[PDB]
Amino acid sequence: ADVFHLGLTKAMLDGATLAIVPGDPERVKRIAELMDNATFLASHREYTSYLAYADGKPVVICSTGIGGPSTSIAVEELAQLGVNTFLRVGTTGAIQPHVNVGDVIVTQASVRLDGASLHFAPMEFPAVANFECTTAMVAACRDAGVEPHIGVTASSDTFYPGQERYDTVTGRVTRRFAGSMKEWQDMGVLNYEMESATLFTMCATQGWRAACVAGVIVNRTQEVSAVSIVVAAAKKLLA
Amino acid sequence: ADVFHLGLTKAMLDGATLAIVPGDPERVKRIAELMDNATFLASHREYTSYLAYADGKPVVICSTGIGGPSTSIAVEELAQLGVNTFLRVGTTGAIQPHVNVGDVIVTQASVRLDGASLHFAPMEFPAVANFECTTAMVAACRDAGVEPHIGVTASSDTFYPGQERYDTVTGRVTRRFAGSMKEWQDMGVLNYEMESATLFTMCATQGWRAACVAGVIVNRTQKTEVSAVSIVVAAAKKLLA
Amino acid sequence: ADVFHLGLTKAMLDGATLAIVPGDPERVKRIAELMDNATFLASHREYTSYLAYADGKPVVICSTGIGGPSTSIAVEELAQLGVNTFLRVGTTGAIQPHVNVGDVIVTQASVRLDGASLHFAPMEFPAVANFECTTAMVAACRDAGVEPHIGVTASSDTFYPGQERYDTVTGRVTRRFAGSMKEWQDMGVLNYEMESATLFTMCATQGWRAACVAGVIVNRTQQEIPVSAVSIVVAAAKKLLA
Amino acid sequence: ADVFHLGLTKAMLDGATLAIVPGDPERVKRIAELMDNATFLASHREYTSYLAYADGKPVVICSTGIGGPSTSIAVEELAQLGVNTFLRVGTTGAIQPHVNVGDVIVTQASVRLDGASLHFAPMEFPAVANFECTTAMVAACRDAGVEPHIGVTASSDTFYPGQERYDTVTGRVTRRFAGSMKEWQDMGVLNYEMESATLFTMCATQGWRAACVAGVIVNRTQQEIPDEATMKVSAVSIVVAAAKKLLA
Amino acid sequence: ADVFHLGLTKAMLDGATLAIVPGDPERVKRIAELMDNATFLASHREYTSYLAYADGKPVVICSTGIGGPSTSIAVEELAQLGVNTFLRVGTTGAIQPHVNVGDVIVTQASVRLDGASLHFAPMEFPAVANFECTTAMVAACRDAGVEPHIGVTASSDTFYPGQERYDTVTGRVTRRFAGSMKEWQDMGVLNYEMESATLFTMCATQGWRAACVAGVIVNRTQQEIPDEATMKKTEVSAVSIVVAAAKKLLA
Amino acid sequence: ADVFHLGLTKAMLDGATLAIVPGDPERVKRIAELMDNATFLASHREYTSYLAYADGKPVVICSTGIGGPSTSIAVEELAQLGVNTFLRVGTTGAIQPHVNVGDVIVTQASVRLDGASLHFAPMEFPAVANFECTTAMVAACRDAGVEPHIGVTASSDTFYPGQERYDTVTGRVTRRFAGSMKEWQDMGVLNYEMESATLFTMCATQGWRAACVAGVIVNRTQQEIPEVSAVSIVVAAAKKLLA
Ligand SMILES: O=c1ccn([C@@H]2O[C@H](CO)[C@@H](O)[C@H]2O)c(=O)[nH]1
């Protein structure tokens, strides 16, 4: 290993400069296999990595785990190995009535309901995706005949209280987050997830490109496509 | 009038749903005359408003004044009259050595060094432009042969201490803003201006589209006005097509 | 010009050290004509400036525009030209049912609902008026046989949600400002306007004098949407220059 | 008693509506004795209280103890008993180089370096004195041939790190307060004390009047704490003169 | 004196390194007299100090006054004179419905509702007691047959609005503290007092040991303030407990 | 499964009310096999769980993953299945020079350099361990001849800038965190890790007991980059609490 967590060496990446970063270690192989010559690199903790080839060029695929702290480790260590572009593919719950189950959201920027983003910039800095990569994701969507919801995502350090879920052992939500779902809804926020605010703030401040695409699993008011889009998006950027 | 500061009624706008929003009232007529049948609407305080037509569609041109507070009045009152799209055009000073004078900046999102943004959403919320409008701005630049710098802008409630200027009467910068220019520079921030954080945050939270383009007039580390006004007019056309 | 925005030089001020600073550029002329030898100086963006004379002494009258960001520019640049005293004259919405439309409010200190103030001092610092200048404003009221309604003013970076106005496109206010008008009311706060927190914090921190009088144009216990003040601020200037 | 800490009943105040509030319980009798018919009311914890008469009018003198939390109990319980005006008389450290030992400072408003003020209003609210009472203090100074320093005071929950004293066991100050004396200095701030931010904020928000005069005991551009080398009209005489004016 | 407020010199402490710090100057004598050869030292402002001897070792007993800012001066000045261990003994309003009047509460850590603690470390730092001293307090309670209530305590710069008391002149509490009592109750917080946040944060950051035990004088689910109807105090005594804890630590 | 992420039902836990919670999924088996009848329950995402018995008492062993957010899911979902005590066993970097690589730290309470703790209580609430469980951990060290460093831990949402590591791509640390290591050192804080502030705040507010022991793998006074001691202690501690 040349990096402490991932178990990777710069040579293992074969000059890859772009990473696809799902949350789940168990989804990394299946993403890798949509491209050419997929090969297992390593597995440690929540970090499962593969290499594969998109229209000739190496792409590393590596899981992040759930949440900003585990994401910030993967992104830093990948970047130590020469990665400069991070495409997140994921799952999400929608909070707008017009965002249907099975739909696709491309996150342009995020509400910072996380703590790791503050380890890169004070809260005034916007958690904003790279314009070129977001453009690539949108065009990959439309190629698939899917018009994506493009907008703001609430990115939370918790799955329960910070997404204002009451279906828990205590049934309690702290004052800060009580009433919060309706607040984001009113402001046009599309969905909740748990990594984009760290991912975006850290890449913007450090000089790397990031974007995020997600298939909607649930809608709080009432996913092959997503992986196929992110691979299409990667090939656009590498072309 | 329908609206208390602008002195406008809805009928006056002839169905316009898109405003170009420069900072200076004296630049309003100038922008309006790039389009057809420019016509004075009203002038009160720092708010001068014209109607013109862009490829046959009605467009409002209205000044905001300097800063978020005056901007927030213009945008709300225009939106009361059916405007839903706000395109900001201006001049700016760059903080990155490779952003030369005569370059163009398209602001994708802003550092919130302002107060009025917080009257729309808590600080966690991003001060981000509409993707569709930002896309139009960038296409408008490229049609004119300009590759814009697209990125993050620091949006300040002050021209002097919030932009870490020491060329003032006291020469003092309060602790919060001491060393702050270097901090934004290291984060890739491109420039300082004084309205985008308010404009972006209020539009994103209230359901309106916003974007911002500016020509670089000075670089803190080291024709362009006409260029930026030309670009915003071309983006308006694209959006209304 | 000797300064970046105003279009003025030090010589144009004829040695004035005191400015009257209305919000509205369209009020500067009226103010100046209450004094002697009123002379147009400049007009750029929201900054219209006149000079006039009070009992032989030059006074500059210059607008700030609406809100702290434009105010911070006018104040700094006039201070560049030797002004050290800034008497704001404005309009205001009363929030206490005892204050009537047409009454005058002298702002001793302000709730900092603005952002420019923080570019001069952290929030713990009081947005407080100069004692001598406030004193002069209160006296000018007494001479005119009017109540000066002296107290605390909420100074907001917005006219709409930060003053908890609901007759708007979306009809909503963000959480921070929902209920906020009732909170200031209960705390005895008199009124809303949009410049005094920035003006006071900047003058206090930078060694300049400031004060603020405003005419009440609406009472918010009744409704959201809406010369005395101007004669008082002129009277006060004269007292300070005597 | 009819309040929980001070040990007082409304009848004990003989209709007083104005209090003089020093920090030290050991100063209360001396202040009371500048007035007429000084009489002990109670003493419990740090709260010593006297009644006396100012040009025929009743006045309660009651100590606050050091800091906003103890002050807030005093001011609330007095106000339960019908007090509506609170004149603090204190001691202070000057932070500007020519505000001398023995001078008096009249505090117009305060930097809120306390926690108790936040239990009355969010930090955006100014910790400002009552205009009427501040004017009377200024007037009482001038009558005595003292021109007071009138301005802004830094009002601190600590005597040591929050006033940037370093002659302490660890000799360290936490990051927030490191360099903070220079920031207040540059801003024209006159002095440090430890009660005015809480007193002013609680009074403005609750509808009571308040003011603050204090004598300088040290100049911090010179010394951290006074000693026998430090220089030798009292603030106590000024506050009693001010009270007479307000109740006339 | 060697210090600016307390009126004490190093010699007067006779080498003492442990202080009992009650909030009230009027309790100091009584505490002192539970030990040997109790002797008055000094009294200035809110600071009354005695010396006594616990199994032959010197113990200083000094009041803090109400609230963190007064507490902070006493703790600093005592440490200037060689004290390194501070055992707070106080009174407290229980906020859980079956923590009864007359029970003892050993505070292990504190909600920081004060401002003096921020003068020692940013709010993210925990206001936590010394493990050894808390252990001695718990042990002193059990020796005495009292199972203490060990947990978290809300430590407030005010007695009225910050403890959500409404029986006041205005009968209003600012937005931040409206509904706050219910918030702490839901989180399992046991009680309110007014010193432990400041004392714990300053001691942890400066390298000194602190602990806090307090007797319950009201239950806030019952009454805002106690009266003659309130349960009367039992022979269970927080002052006896603190003295017994001191002895364990000095042994 | 009766919970959304862990893949568990209540019946699978055999009545267990205490969990040992390491950060690494690969550590779960190793911990379980220090106990009796180690039994695989589930593996999903970063969440690997075993059941085992501690002197006859059932105990769940479930990874949290790195960081508060993943920790918060595991703690909540276990508690839905009847777990009420959470003993974290981890690794840590020491920031005090007297702490050696290989020593154990028992965390009494944590500096909240995390964001998930704020999803349970505002920042004034102390990130403090359960007194009983901390005392059991101290006793287990003592029974094993190891002196626990008991104190305050800085618990950070990042491994790099928030622990003021400079050997990174950009080698920059944001203003808030520049000089922070020295600040903590000066305040007597022992060590950095990445889960305790979330764990402690969420348990204390929710009515559950939590404690945390970690083995020192690096001393930051010397360098930035670096079971079975720590794990032995947490198992011994579990036995104490369920007796
Ligand atoms: O309710 C009101 C009425 C007037 N103003 C003042 O008048 C201008 C807006 O009409 C602003 O400069 C502000 O100073 C208010 O803030 N609120």
PDB file of C-alpha atoms in Angstrom, chain F residues 61-229:
ATOM      1  CA  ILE F  61     -20.642  -7.515  17.763  1.00  0.00           C
ATOM      2  CA  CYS F  62     -21.352  -5.095  14.977  1.00  0.00           C
ATOM      3  CA  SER F  63     -19.129  -2.759  13.000  1.00  0.00           C
ATOM      4  CA  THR F  64     -19.953   0.900  12.650  1.00  0.00           C
ATOM      5  CA  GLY F  65     -17.728   1.930   9.737  1.00  0.00           C
ATOM      6  CA  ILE F  66     -15.545   5.083  10.011  1.00  0.00           C
ATOM      7  CA  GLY F  67     -17.341   8.172  11.188  1.00  0.00           C
ATOM      8  CA  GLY F  68     -20.413   9.395  12.977  1.00  0.00           C
ATOM      9  CA  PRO F  69     -22.961   9.047  10.172  1.00  0.00           C
ATOM     10  CA  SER F  70     -22.400   5.272   9.680  1.00  0.00           C
ATOM     11  CA  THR F  71     -22.110   4.829  13.496  1.00  0.00           C
ATOM     12  CA  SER F  72     -25.473   6.598  13.949  1.00  0.00           C
ATOM     13  CA  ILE F  73     -27.295   4.088  11.701  1.00  0.00           C
ATOM     14  CA  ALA F  74     -25.834   1.045  13.471  1.00  0.00           C
ATOM     15  CA  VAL F  75     -26.485   2.323  17.010  1.00  0.00           C
ATOM     16  CA  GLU F  76     -30.112   3.318  16.238  1.00  0.00           C
ATOM     17  CA  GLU F  77     -30.946  -0.010  14.427  1.00  0.00           C
ATOM     18  CA  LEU F  78     -29.386  -2.111  17.155  1.00  0.00           C
ATOM     19  CA  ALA F  79     -31.355  -0.165  19.765  1.00  0.00           C
ATOM     20  CA  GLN F  80     -34.500  -0.962  17.717  1.00  0.00           C
ATOM     21  CA  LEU F  81     -33.699  -4.649  18.373  1.00  0.00           C
ATOM     22  CA  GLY F  82     -33.236  -4.203  22.165  1.00  0.00           C
ATOM     23  CA  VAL F  83     -29.623  -3.200  22.561  1.00  0.00           C
ATOM     24  CA  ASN F  84     -29.166  -0.573  25.274  1.00  0.00           C
ATOM     25  CA  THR F  85     -25.369  -0.610  25.924  1.00  0.00           C
ATOM     26  CA  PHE F  86     -22.674   0.176  23.295  1.00  0.00           C
ATOM     27  CA  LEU F  87     -18.935  -0.487  24.013  1.00  0.00           C
ATOM     28  CA  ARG F  88     -16.766   0.985  21.246  1.00  0.00           C
ATOM     29  CA  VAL F  89     -13.321  -0.587  20.678  1.00  0.00           C
ATOM     30  CA  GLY F  90     -11.083   1.287  18.261  1.00  0.00           C
ATOM     31  CA  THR F  91      -7.672   2.666  17.211  1.00  0.00           C
ATOM     32  CA  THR F  92      -6.353   6.121  17.901  1.00  0.00           C
ATOM     33  CA  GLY F  93      -3.495   8.580  17.408  1.00  0.00           C
ATOM     34  CA  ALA F  94      -2.006   9.982  20.700  1.00  0.00           C
ATOM     35  CA  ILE F  95      -1.212  13.735  20.876  1.00  0.00           C
ATOM     36  CA  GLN F  96       0.544  13.737  24.307  1.00  0.00           C
ATOM     37  CA  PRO F  97       4.190  12.735  24.356  1.00  0.00           C
ATOM     38  CA  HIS F  98       3.924  10.449  27.417  1.00  0.00           C
ATOM     39  CA  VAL F  99       1.476   8.115  25.581  1.00  0.00           C
ATOM     40  CA  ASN F 100       3.241   5.223  23.799  1.00  0.00           C
ATOM     41  CA  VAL F 101       2.242   3.245  20.702  1.00  0.00           C
ATOM     42  CA  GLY F 102       0.520   0.148  22.117  1.00  0.00           C
ATOM     43  CA  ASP F 103      -1.010   1.857  25.222  1.00  0.00           C
ATOM     44  CA  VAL F 104      -4.824   1.914  25.689  1.00  0.00           C
ATOM     45  CA  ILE F 105      -6.931   5.099  26.115  1.00  0.00           C
ATOM     46  CA  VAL F 106     -10.344   5.005  27.867  1.00  0.00           C
ATOM     47  CA  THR F 107     -12.360   8.034  26.698  1.00  0.00           C
ATOM     48  CA  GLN F 108     -14.386   9.692  29.472  1.00  0.00           C
ATOM     49  CA  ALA F 109     -15.812  12.412  27.137  1.00  0.00           C
ATOM     50  CA  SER F 110     -15.021  13.912  23.666  1.00  0.00           C
ATOM     51  CA  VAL F 111     -14.391  17.225  21.922  1.00  0.00           C
ATOM     52  CA  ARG F 112     -17.202  17.386  19.345  1.00  0.00           C
ATOM     53  CA  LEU F 113     -15.372  17.835  16.028  1.00  0.00           C
ATOM     54  CA  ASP F 114     -18.179  15.927  14.322  1.00  0.00           C
ATOM     55  CA  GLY F 115     -21.478  16.877  12.735  1.00  0.00           C
ATOM     56  CA  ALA F 116     -23.714  13.897  13.621  1.00  0.00           C
ATOM     57  CA  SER F 117     -23.636  14.723  17.360  1.00  0.00           C
ATOM     58  CA  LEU F 118     -25.550  17.974  16.486  1.00  0.00           C
ATOM     59  CA  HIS F 119     -28.349  15.778  15.041  1.00  0.00           C
ATOM     60  CA  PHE F 120     -29.023  14.716  18.654  1.00  0.00           C
ATOM     61  CA  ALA F 121     -28.258  17.790  20.822  1.00  0.00           C
ATOM     62  CA  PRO F 122     -26.938  21.322  20.401  1.00  0.00           C
ATOM     63  CA  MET F 123     -23.215  21.850  20.900  1.00  0.00           C
ATOM     64  CA  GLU F 124     -23.427  22.812  24.673  1.00  0.00           C
ATOM     65  CA  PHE F 125     -24.402  19.219  25.540  1.00  0.00           C
ATOM     66  CA  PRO F 126     -21.366  17.241  26.719  1.00  0.00           C
ATOM     67  CA  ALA F 127     -20.196  14.238  24.640  1.00  0.00           C
ATOM     68  CA  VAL F 128     -19.744  12.113  27.778  1.00  0.00           C
ATOM     69  CA  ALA F 129     -19.527   8.361  28.342  1.00  0.00           C
ATOM     70  CA  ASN F 130     -21.664   6.352  30.783  1.00  0.00           C
ATOM     71  CA  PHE F 131     -20.091   6.365  34.276  1.00  0.00           C
ATOM     72  CA  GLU F 132     -20.775   2.641  34.911  1.00  0.00           C
ATOM     73  CA  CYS F 133     -19.401   1.449  31.576  1.00  0.00           C
ATOM     74  CA  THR F 134     -16.305   3.688  31.879  1.00  0.00           C
ATOM     75  CA  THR F 135     -15.677   2.334  35.336  1.00  0.00           C
ATOM     76  CA  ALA F 136     -15.939  -1.239  33.969  1.00  0.00           C
ATOM     77  CA  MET F 137     -13.360  -0.476  31.304  1.00  0.00           C
ATOM     78  CA  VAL F 138     -10.939   1.047  33.865  1.00  0.00           C
ATOM     79  CA  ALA F 139     -11.370  -2.103  36.034  1.00  0.00           C
ATOM     80  CA  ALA F 140     -10.712  -4.390  33.067  1.00  0.00           C
ATOM     81  CA  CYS F 141      -7.433  -2.495  32.342  1.00  0.00           C
ATOM     82  CA  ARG F 142      -6.524  -2.782  36.001  1.00  0.00           C
ATOM     83  CA  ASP F 143      -7.280  -6.537  36.069  1.00  0.00           C
ATOM     84  CA  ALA F 144      -4.965  -6.914  33.036  1.00  0.00           C
ATOM     85  CA  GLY F 145      -2.043  -4.893  34.518  1.00  0.00           C
ATOM     86  CA  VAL F 146      -2.447  -1.976  32.082  1.00  0.00           C
ATOM     87  CA  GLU F 147      -2.844   1.628  33.315  1.00  0.00           C
ATOM     88  CA  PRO F 148      -5.625   3.277  31.256  1.00  0.00           C
ATOM     89  CA  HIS F 149      -5.016   6.805  30.093  1.00  0.00           C
ATOM     90  CA  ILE F 150      -8.395   8.107  31.158  1.00  0.00           C
ATOM     91  CA  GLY F 151      -9.320  11.509  29.702  1.00  0.00           C
ATOM     92  CA  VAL F 152     -10.631  13.713  26.943  1.00  0.00           C
ATOM     93  CA  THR F 153     -10.480  12.680  23.255  1.00  0.00           C
ATOM     94  CA  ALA F 154     -10.812  14.848  20.179  1.00  0.00           C
ATOM     95  CA  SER F 155     -13.388  13.113  17.928  1.00  0.00           C
ATOM     96  CA  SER F 156     -13.123  14.361  14.311  1.00  0.00           C
ATOM     97  CA  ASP F 157     -15.230  13.954  11.129  1.00  0.00           C
ATOM     98  CA  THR F 158     -11.999  13.718   9.040  1.00  0.00           C
ATOM     99  CA  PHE F 159      -8.676  11.724   9.339  1.00  0.00           C
ATOM    100  CA  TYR F 160      -6.682  14.486   7.514  1.00  0.00           C
ATOM    101  CA  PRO F 161      -7.347  18.277   8.027  1.00  0.00           C
ATOM    102  CA  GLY F 162      -9.493  17.942  11.156  1.00  0.00           C
ATOM    103  CA  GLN F 163      -6.676  16.070  12.916  1.00  0.00           C
ATOM    104  CA  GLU F 164      -4.332  18.703  11.469  1.00  0.00           C
ATOM    105  CA  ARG F 165      -2.434  16.304   9.183  1.00  0.00           C
ATOM    106  CA  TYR F 166      -0.379  18.211   6.636  1.00  0.00           C
ATOM    107  CA  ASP F 167       1.072  15.356   4.552  1.00  0.00           C
ATOM    108  CA  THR F 168      -1.732  15.545   2.023  1.00  0.00           C
ATOM    109  CA  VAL F 169      -2.202  16.439  -1.614  1.00  0.00           C
ATOM    110  CA  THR F 170      -2.600  20.148  -1.069  1.00  0.00           C
ATOM    111  CA  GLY F 171      -0.812  20.307   2.340  1.00  0.00           C
ATOM    112  CA  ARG F 172      -3.295  22.968   3.492  1.00  0.00           C
ATOM    113  CA  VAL F 173      -5.560  22.960   6.607  1.00  0.00           C
ATOM    114  CA  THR F 174      -8.557  25.290   6.759  1.00  0.00           C
ATOM    115  CA  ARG F 175      -8.354  28.297   9.221  1.00  0.00           C
ATOM    116  CA  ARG F 176     -10.579  26.703  11.792  1.00  0.00           C
ATOM    117  CA  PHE F 177      -8.237  23.693  12.128  1.00  0.00           C
ATOM    118  CA  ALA F 178      -4.839  25.416  11.663  1.00  0.00           C
ATOM    119  CA  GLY F 179      -3.116  25.255  15.108  1.00  0.00           C
ATOM    120  CA  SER F 180      -5.912  23.096  16.544  1.00  0.00           C
ATOM    121  CA  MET F 181      -3.703  20.128  17.502  1.00  0.00           C
ATOM    122  CA  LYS F 182      -1.648  22.420  19.800  1.00  0.00           C
ATOM    123  CA  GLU F 183      -4.839  23.853  21.237  1.00  0.00           C
ATOM    124  CA  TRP F 184      -6.042  20.356  22.275  1.00  0.00           C
ATOM    125  CA  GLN F 185      -2.581  19.388  23.548  1.00  0.00           C
ATOM    126  CA  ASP F 186      -2.509  22.501  25.717  1.00  0.00           C
ATOM    127  CA  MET F 187      -5.982  21.529  27.085  1.00  0.00           C
ATOM    128  CA  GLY F 188      -4.768  18.062  28.134  1.00  0.00           C
ATOM    129  CA  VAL F 189      -6.657  16.164  25.411  1.00  0.00           C
ATOM    130  CA  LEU F 190      -5.047  12.683  24.961  1.00  0.00           C
ATOM    131  CA  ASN F 191      -5.816  11.571  21.442  1.00  0.00           C
ATOM    132  CA  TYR F 192      -7.787  11.724  18.167  1.00  0.00           C
ATOM    133  CA  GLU F 193     -10.324   9.240  16.810  1.00  0.00           C
ATOM    134  CA  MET F 194     -13.478   9.474  14.606  1.00  0.00           C
ATOM    135  CA  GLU F 195     -16.640   7.956  16.326  1.00  0.00           C
ATOM    136  CA  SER F 196     -16.813   8.699  20.067  1.00  0.00           C
ATOM    137  CA  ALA F 197     -18.409  12.221  19.959  1.00  0.00           C
ATOM    138  CA  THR F 198     -21.335  10.891  17.835  1.00  0.00           C
ATOM    139  CA  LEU F 199     -21.692   7.660  19.856  1.00  0.00           C
ATOM    140  CA  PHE F 200     -21.575   9.389  23.244  1.00  0.00           C
ATOM    141  CA  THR F 201     -23.967  12.208  22.383  1.00  0.00           C
ATOM    142  CA  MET F 202     -26.505  10.031  20.653  1.00  0.00           C
ATOM    143  CA  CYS F 203     -26.486   7.420  23.571  1.00  0.00           C
ATOM    144  CA  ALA F 204     -26.582   9.981  26.441  1.00  0.00           C
ATOM    145  CA  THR F 205     -29.545  11.799  24.855  1.00  0.00           C
ATOM    146  CA  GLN F 206     -31.422   8.633  23.961  1.00  0.00           C
ATOM    147  CA  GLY F 207     -31.172   6.738  27.223  1.00  0.00           C
ATOM    148  CA  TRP F 208     -28.490   4.178  26.310  1.00  0.00           C
ATOM    149  CA  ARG F 209     -25.101   3.530  27.901  1.00  0.00           C
ATOM    150  CA  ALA F 210     -21.851   3.931  25.867  1.00  0.00           C
ATOM    151  CA  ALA F 211     -18.079   3.733  26.531  1.00  0.00           C
ATOM    152  CA  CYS F 212     -14.954   3.686  24.339  1.00  0.00           C
ATOM    153  CA  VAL F 213     -11.481   2.060  24.627  1.00  0.00           C
ATOM    154  CA  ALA F 214      -8.852   2.385  21.848  1.00  0.00           C
ATOM    155  CA  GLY F 215      -5.262   1.190  21.257  1.00  0.00           C
ATOM    156  CA  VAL F 216      -2.686   3.791  20.330  1.00  0.00           C
ATOM    157  CA  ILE F 217      -1.194   3.123  16.918  1.00  0.00           C
ATOM    158  CA  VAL F 218       0.666   6.371  16.377  1.00  0.00           C
ATOM    159  CA  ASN F 219       1.936   9.310  18.376  1.00  0.00           C
ATOM    160  CA  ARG F 220       1.372  12.616  16.505  1.00  0.00           C
ATOM    161  CA  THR F 221       4.211  14.291  18.367  1.00  0.00           C
ATOM    162  CA  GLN F 222       6.430  12.076  16.199  1.00  0.00           C
ATOM    163  CA  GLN F 223       4.633  11.313  12.938  1.00  0.00           C
ATOM    164  CA  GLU F 224       1.316  11.451  11.060  1.00  0.00           C
ATOM    165  CA  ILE F 225       0.979   7.901   9.597  1.00  0.00           C
ATOM    166  CA  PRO F 226       1.094   4.688  11.785  1.00  0.00           C
ATOM    167  CA  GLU F 227      -6.573  -5.223  19.268  1.00  0.00           C
ATOM    168  CA  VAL F 228      -5.434  -7.362  20.684  1.00  0.00           C
ATOM    169  CA  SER F 229      -4.887  -5.322  23.881  1.00  0.00           C
TER     170      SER F 229
END
